[PDB]
Amino acid sequence: MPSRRERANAIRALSMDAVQKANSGHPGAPMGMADIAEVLWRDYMQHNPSNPQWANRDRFVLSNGHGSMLIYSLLHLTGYDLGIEDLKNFRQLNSRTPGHPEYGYTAGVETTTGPLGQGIANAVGMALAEKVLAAQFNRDGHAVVDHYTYAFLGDGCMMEGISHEVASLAGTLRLNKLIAFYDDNGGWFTDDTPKRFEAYGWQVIRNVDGHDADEIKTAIDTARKSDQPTLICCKTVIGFADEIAATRAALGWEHAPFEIPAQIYAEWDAKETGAAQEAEWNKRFAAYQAAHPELAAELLRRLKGELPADFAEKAAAYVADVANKGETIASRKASQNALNAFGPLLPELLGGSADTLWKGCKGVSADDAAGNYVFYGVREFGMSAIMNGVALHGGFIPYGATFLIFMEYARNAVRMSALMKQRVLYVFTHDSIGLGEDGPTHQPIEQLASLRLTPNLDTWRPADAVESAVAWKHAIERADGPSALIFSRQNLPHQARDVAQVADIARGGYVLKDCEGEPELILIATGSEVGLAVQAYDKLSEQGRKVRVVSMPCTSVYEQQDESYKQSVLPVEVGARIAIEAAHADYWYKYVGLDGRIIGMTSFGESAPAPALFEHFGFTLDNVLAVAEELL
Amino acid sequence: MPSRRERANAIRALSMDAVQKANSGHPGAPMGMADIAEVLWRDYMQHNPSNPQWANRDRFVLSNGHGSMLIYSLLHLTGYDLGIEDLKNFRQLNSRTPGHPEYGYTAGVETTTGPLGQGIANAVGMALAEKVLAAQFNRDGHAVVDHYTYAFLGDGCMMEGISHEVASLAGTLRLNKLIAFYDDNGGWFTDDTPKRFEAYGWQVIRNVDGHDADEIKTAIDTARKSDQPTLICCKTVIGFADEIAATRAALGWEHAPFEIPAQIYAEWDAKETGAAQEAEWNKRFAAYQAAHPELAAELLRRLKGELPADFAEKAAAYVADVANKGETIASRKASQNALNAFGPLLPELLGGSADTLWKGCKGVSADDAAGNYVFYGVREFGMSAIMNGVALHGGFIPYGATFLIFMEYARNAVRMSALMKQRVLYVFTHDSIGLGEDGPTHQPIEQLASLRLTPNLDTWRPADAVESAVAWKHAIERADGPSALIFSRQNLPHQARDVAQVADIARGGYVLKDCEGEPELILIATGSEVGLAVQAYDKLSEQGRKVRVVSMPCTSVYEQQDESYKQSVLPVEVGARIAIEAAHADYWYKYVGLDGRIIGMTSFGESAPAPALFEHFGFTLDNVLAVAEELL
Ligand SMILES: [Ca+2]
Ligand SMILES: [Ca+2]
Ligand SMILES: [Ca+2]
Ligand SMILES: [Ca+2]
């Protein structure tokens, strides 16, 4: 009869043998945390290896990303579709077992980790999703949404700033079904971490012997009854060819690499209990569907990530309405306008801002999570990684707003949205020197380019309300990647368009103003600079010059268009091209090459009123004409 | 006889009148914190308005960046070169009073703030600089370096992750002369902030009435005796045309906008005490210079930011030695090699890593700060903003290392280094898919481009040890901006060069391999991809093709070169150009336009051994030849 320790040692054996064979990786977390995992996964975790997408499974997040063999071991041992051959391919090209866990490519991996601090943030988001979805959907006698979020984290995560942001907020929102296990395994890190977490309003369980199954169980039982999120502080000491063989022998583990005894597999396998757990929940879901069929249909739709059947038609009708009202407003107001039309169609939208609001917004709070808007406070990074967790969890389409400059605080989370191919919607306001007096520390220059070079991210910089509506629609309908929607503080004039041009906004780049025959000059512009481009077009046309304005609200989408469409907008034979954008010039060589010109920014901004800054930096009619004159 | 409150109200009056006239900005911090400032600045602060560069002045940092009128009011009132006319130009183009304080442009502003959390981090760096410089230079009977670092911060700073990183480290290093005043002025922020700071090993003074001068003084006296950094938690409630007039009248402030009574100016003026304070310290410095002239000379040199007279000659000799040893090593090893040669020449270097080390490194600790290397722990953002504070303080040249991917965690601090034009040296390792198995979450793609589009930042990606030595030398000698030095994990072959080519490395971009007459093809490469470019050059030359290799270790420097030098490296008439770099392709349109080609990355990476990833992503001899064939 295998002991708990023998079963935990299977995780230790597989981890160290996998690392050894790959000659790469680190068996830290699995060595230290295996006994904790054996209790947690065998005695508490509700999950079905046959269906890792069961909507009411418990969520487990390994924030110590480097501990990847811990999760691969657990998934293999408990019966997921991850075999011994996968473990022997750890860290090899296109294996199912990459060096850090990657959501999508591996059955049972709930998020992509590696960058420290973000795992715990993702877990915070998942626990938030569960709490909100439960408050939205649960009814008397039908607790259909009801599961825990368990996370493992280490010293690295605790040192990172993002831990402070997301633990603080988790405390304020009372995410009592978030239960985190800190691997306190042991010059630069002396925090009293338990006291710090009490300051956030968490319950803390101190000094848990991480190699004692009775202590671990007692802590977990306490945490599962908590009214607050709980941090279980686990003291561990196990861990680190000769060193491996020594430790392996000390553990009393005699078996050859990758061989696990049949009774150990039997005691780890979760297919039997897992089947029964999901079947029991399916029975409760059917009861819910009978008693509340409208809700239940909405829940399923939302869990699938499907939009309402008529959203596309209503949204295109809305885009057309806007194109007819023809207002001149800040793209920031057009965004709030789009949310006002789209919000009431999309009960799955979960908005917020790093403290955006439309008429039906209702803030979530600890006492009442049935809302649809989160006040994240001054926590840009934490907001972003939380939104990743919300998106992974299912049930919502999250969006989150801050100033474009503070994208930089959240930069790696934005990158992770893209890497994981999640539909997370970033709203970045105050997009340029147009913000005026706040000055160079707040004025973006290089940030648009940073977003545009992020793979799988779409960045929309709408020239007016019509393009703002198209951008939101497109972002919402994009299920397989994130979008960043960039808005001005200042007013943007409505642009005239025919039906076909409004349609072509969705192609990322299109002809807004044209000449009869091949243009002598092409003005490419985005966002708040399209209006200036149109002025230059007006003026230059009066001189008999054959000019075209191309509005480029989304470069990544434009690039995805077919060769013949691209030739129709930016013909390869017209080298006389001028890009106009209040952002870093260097990006635009992609579109004007070495034969064209760029009217952009090549320095930091200044603290002055916007009109004075635009004058100062050359975003004037006169300067554009001069550049054209020089170029032609 | 003006009361304390009347004197504090001068700050309130000027702040609100300045904001009103500009119709922009927020008088929050000055309204709330004016009584605290009146105690702190009149009764405690050691400073000389006639010389804001006095080396032993106390340092004051306003982390609530939006509170800019607080500092402009203090500087004006106490007699700095900032007049009433400057205050009336708050937030106007090229005024001395920009919307957020900017170091360099305004007498007495110690750092540029605005992005929340970074002010306090900068203050942490300044207190670290003082503590290290004192331990390095002070001797029995000559406490020549001896001053406090006072900082104001608010809720926004406290919510930001960076506060956790820098307060944690400040606690560990016992920066007991750092004294911070928290404006606790009052849904999303419920931390028990005092308890959190105790967990970092700070002293906390709770519940200080921020409008009671006796309570404020008592707290400051306690803090000034503390063995730990101290957080003074100040409860404030004062603050927010009609509303302004109401508050102004309530305060009993009858005077017209911008008029301050003569006795209030008299009681605020610090020119008399300031003169005496600096004169007293100058007398002690002379005594130190008599007793320890070598040290004292070194201190002055270092405070001036001057390098040793013979550093340039020794460093060029070193570059030449490396060019002769001709080794093939990871650029990461060449960096450590350069530090081994340069380190012992530069006692001002203050290194570190977000836990790099050369033979004479000695770690700083709480008990012994006489070292030259800081273990920042897993705190990339905090490290970077701290280094800014170290650079501003004087006495050091800081450098700090992390993985290139985690530049993203510290992104805005890097931008702030550049904005402030400070010599801070960023060392970014593991620069590409060449890092291998750790996989896409760690593998940079877009980060080089992000650095390259940062104004006033130089980014060096050295192809071998010779270029690594040139890059370090150039970075060290660059006093008016920061540098980012980018290193590979994998081995880089030595490139053959004549004397003139080694010299031209310092020009940012140069001809490494050439053809007789005008080239038919130009291969532009950087860093670890230059070796592949040379292979392609060898192969293609054998075919009779006229090829050139341009090595481009620093684009920003290359761009600063004269037109005729640029024409000599990248002739405008040779359109057949191929850029080769294991990073995002889109950057390179700047150098190859629409007629050339790019062999780079356009996706995230993968988890595999490096050779397999280079094969997979097309960094092979065969692929390069194919692209040339297609292009020609
Ligand atoms: Ca215990
Ligand atoms: Ca439909
Ligand atoms: Ca009190
Ligand atoms: Ca010399």
Q: In what order do the strands lie in the sheet with A483-486?
A: A373-375, A349-353, A397-403, A425-429, A483-486, A458-460
* CA nearest neighbour of B481 among B407, B383, B557, B372: B557
Which residue(s) pair with A151 in the sheet? A61, A180
**CATH number of A548's domain:** 3.40.50.920
Q: Is residue A501 located within the same domain as residue A537?
A: no
User: Chain B contacts of A159, Cβ < 8 Å?
Assistant: 165, 168, 377-379
Residue B377, exposed/middle/buried by CB under 10 A (0-12, 13-18, 19+)? Answer: buried
Distance CA B196, CA B377 (A): 19
Q: Which residues make beta-bridge pairs with B330?
A: B491
Does A207 carry a binding-site annotation?
A: yes
Same domain, A441 and A458: yes
Residue that is last in its domain, among A281, A300, A319: A300
Residue keyed to tokens 């530069």: B346
Between CA B82 and CA A336 the distance in angstroms is: 42
Q: Which one of B115, B165, B604 has the shortest CB-CB distance to A441?
A: B115
**Environment class of A367 (CB within 10 Å of its CB; exposed 0-12, middle 13-18, buried 19+):** exposed
Q: How far apart are alpha carbons A269 and A29 in whole angstroms? A: 22
- Taking CB atoms and an 8 Å cutoff, what residues of chain B touch A200? 191-192, 196
d(CA A114, CA A107): 18
B226: left (phi over 0), alpha (psi -120 to 50) or beta: beta
Query: Hey, are the CB atoms on B441 and A603 less than 8 Å from each other?
Result: no
Q: Are B498 and B492 in contact (CB under 8 A)?
A: no
Residues B589 and B491 in one domain: no
Residue tagged 């010293």 (tokens): A155
Return phi, psi of residue B397, to 5°. Answer: -120, 105
Nearest to B381 by CA among A182, A62, A117, A420: A117
Rounded distance between C-alpha atoms, residue B253 and residue B505, angstroms: 64
A236, A185 contact by CB (below 8 A): yes
Name the amino acid, one letter, at B568.
S
Tell me the residue type at B564.
Answer: S
- A62: alpha, beta or left? (left if phi > 0; alpha if psi -120 to 50): beta
Q: Is B629 a catalytic residue?
A: no
Provide φ and ψ at A503, rounded to 5°.
-60, -45
Q: At A384, give phi and psi (nearest 5°).
A: -65, -45
Angle of CA points B366, B368, B372, to nearest 5°:
100
Bridge partners of residue B202, in order along the sequence: none
Q: Three-state SS for A189?
A: coil
User: How far apart, in Å, are the Cα atoms of B161 and each of A377, A383, A551, B121?
Assistant: 12, 11, 38, 11
* Pairwise CB contact (< 8 Å): B437 & A91: yes
CA B292 from centroid of its chain's CA atoms: 32
**Quick check: A439 and B114 CB within 8 A?**
yes
Nearest CA to A183 out of A151, A226, A214 is that of: A151
| 3-state secondary structure at position A17 | helix
Closest among A59, A16, A67, A25 to A41, alpha carbons compared:
A59
> Mind telling me the catalytic residues of A?
380
Residue A175, SS3?
Answer: coil
Is there a binding annotation on residue A622?
A: no
Alpha helices, H only, A229-379: 242-250, 262-268, 271-291, 293-304, 311-325, 331-342
Radius of gyration of chain A from Cα atoms?
Answer: 27
Is position A309 annotated in a ligand binding site? yes
Q: Are residues B341 and B422 in the same domain?
A: yes
Extract the annotated binding site of B for thiamine diphosphate: 66, 114-116, 156, 185, 406
The answer to whether the Cβ–Cβ distance between A112 and B441 falls below 8 Å is yes
For residue B599, give the 3-state DSSP assignment: strand
Q: φ, ψ for residue A143 (rounded to 5)?
A: -85, 70
Dist. CA A430–CA A404, nearest whole Å: 6
Tokens of B153: 């911060």
Task: Please choose, from the candidates B163, B164, B65, B170, the residue with its C-alpha nearest in 3D space to the C-alpha of residue B126.
Answer: B170
Instruction: For residue B525, list its beta bridge partners.
Output: B551, B580
Residues A583 and A601 sit within 8 Å (Cβ to Cβ): yes
| DSSP assignments along B82-98, one per residue | --HHHHHTTTSTT-SS-
Query: Do B38 and B11 contact (CB within 8 A), yes or no?
Result: yes
- Which residues in chain B are closer than 8 Å to A156, comparing Cβ atoms? 378
A191: nearest CB among B156, B200, B450:
B200
CB-based neighbours (< 5 A) of ligand 2, an ion: A 312
Here the CATH number for the domain that contains residue A474 is 3.40.50.970
Distance, CA of B173 to CA of B165 (rounded, Å): 13
Tell me the two tokens of residue B170. Answer: 């400040």
Q: In angstroms, rounded to a whole number, what is the distance separating the alpha carbons of residues A366 and A459?
A: 34
Contacts of residue A215, Cβ cutoff 8 Å, sequence gap at least 6? A208, A209
* Rounded Cα gap, residues B425 and B460, in angstroms: 11
Number of domains into which chain B is organized: 3
Residues 6+ away with beta carbon under 8 Å from B268: B7, B10, B42, B77, B78, B79
Same domain, B262 and B319: no
- A231 in Cβ contact with A205 (< 8 Å): yes
Cβ(A216)–Cβ(A208) below 8 Å: yes
Q: Tell me the three state secondary structure of residue B156.
A: helix
> What is the spatial order of strands in the sheet that A178-184 belongs to?
A59-62, A149-153, A178-184, A230-235, A203-209
Secondary structure of residue A352 in the 3-state scheme = strand
Q: How far is A489 from chain B (nearest CA, A)?
A: 14
Task: Give exposure, A538-560, as e/b (b: 16+ Cβ within 10 Å).
Answer: ebbeeeeeebbbbbbbbbbbbee
Return the sign of the alpha-carbon dihedral for residues A197, A199, A204, A207.
positive
DSSP string, A65-80: GGGHHHHHHHHHHHT-
At residue B130, the 3 state secondary structure works out as: helix
The answer to whether the beta carbons of residues B158 and B182 sit under 8 Å apart is yes
> What are the distances in angstroms from CA A297 to CA A279, A304, B625?
19, 11, 57
Using CB atoms, pick whichever of B99, B419, B584 lies closest to residue A437: B99
Q: Are B501 and B523 part of one and the same domain?
A: no
Coil/strand/helix, residue B581: strand
Ligand 4 centre to CA of B562 (Å) is: 25
Q: Are residues B2 and B14 in the same domain?
A: yes
Ligand 4 mean position, distance from CA B495 (Å): 28
Same domain, B601 and B513: yes
Question: Residues B98, B142: contact at Cβ < 8 Å?
Answer: no
Dump the DSSP string for A217-271.
Answer: HHHHHHHHT-SS-EEEEEE------HHHHHHHHHTT--SPTT---HHHHHHH--H
Last residue of a domain, one of B482, B506, B530: B506
Residue A81 φ/ψ, nearest 5 degrees: -80, 70
A175 labeled binding residue? no
Degrees (nearest 5) of the Cα angle B374, B376, B378?
155
Burial category of B517 from C-beta neighbours within 10 Å (exposed 0-12, middle 13-18, buried 19 and up): exposed
**Rounded CA gap, A163 and B161, in Å?**
7
**Contact between residue A483 and residue A427 where contact means Cβ atoms under 8 Å apart:** no
Domain that holds residue A88: 1-300
- Alpha-carbon distance A31 to nearest alpha carbon in chain B (angstroms): 19
Contact present, A411 and B408 (Cβ < 8 Å): yes
A-chain residues near B440 (CB < 8 A): 98, 102, 419
Residue B135, judged by CB atoms within 10 A of its CB (0-12, 13-18, 19+), counts as middle
Closest Cα of chain A to B237: distance in Å? 21
The whole-angstrom separation of Cα A119 and Cα A106 is: 17
Alpha carbon of residue B616 to chain centroid? 37
Distance in angstroms (rounded) separating the CA atoms of residues B451 and B391: 20
Q: Nearest CA to CA, how far is A606 from chain B (Å)? A: 7
Q: Does residue A441 contact residue B65 with C-beta atoms inside 8 Å?
A: yes
CA distances from B613 to A313, B599, B606 (A): 44, 14, 7
CA distance A372 to A349: 7
CB contact under 8 A, A412 and B419: no
Say yes or no: B407 and B468 in one domain: yes
Beta strands (DSSP E) in B451-516 are: 458-460, 483-486, 491-492, 510-513
Q: Confirm if A158 and A376 have CB atoms less than 8 A apart.
A: no
Residue A428 shares a structural domain with residue A559: no
Calculate the alpha carbon distances from A180 to A183, A212, A228, B255 in Å. Answer: 10, 17, 12, 58
* CB contact (8 A) between residue A189 and residue B171: no
HSE at residue A149, side-chain half, CA atoms within 13 A, is 29
Count the Cβ atoms, other than its own, within 10 Å of residue A516: 6
- Taken as a whole, chain B contains a residue count of 632
Q: Which of A253, A278, A300 is the last residue of a domain?
A: A300
d(CA A94, CA B44): 64
Biggest CA-to-CA distance, chain A: 93
Is A402 in the same domain as A353? yes
Residues A423 and A527 in one domain: no
What is the Cα–Cα distance from A334 to B492, expressed in whole angstroms?
A: 52
B491-492 and B597-601 beta bridge pairing: unpaired
How far apart are alpha carbons A493 and A506 in whole angstroms?
A: 19
Residues B570, B571, B572, CA angle at the centre, nearest 5°? 110
8 Å CB contact between B24 and A437: yes
Among the residues of B146-192, which ranges form H helices?
155-159, 161-172
> What's the B190 CA to ligand 3 centre distance in angstroms?
20
Helix (H, G, I), strand (E, B) or coil at B384: helix
Q: What is the DSSP letter of A463?
A: S
Q: What is the number of alpha carbons within 13 Å of residue A606 lying toward its C-beta?
A: 19
**Could you tell me which chain A residue has the CA closest to the CA of B26?**
A438
Look up residue A176 and give its two tokens. 């009592």
CA–CA gap between residue B443 and residue A112 (Å, rounded)? 14
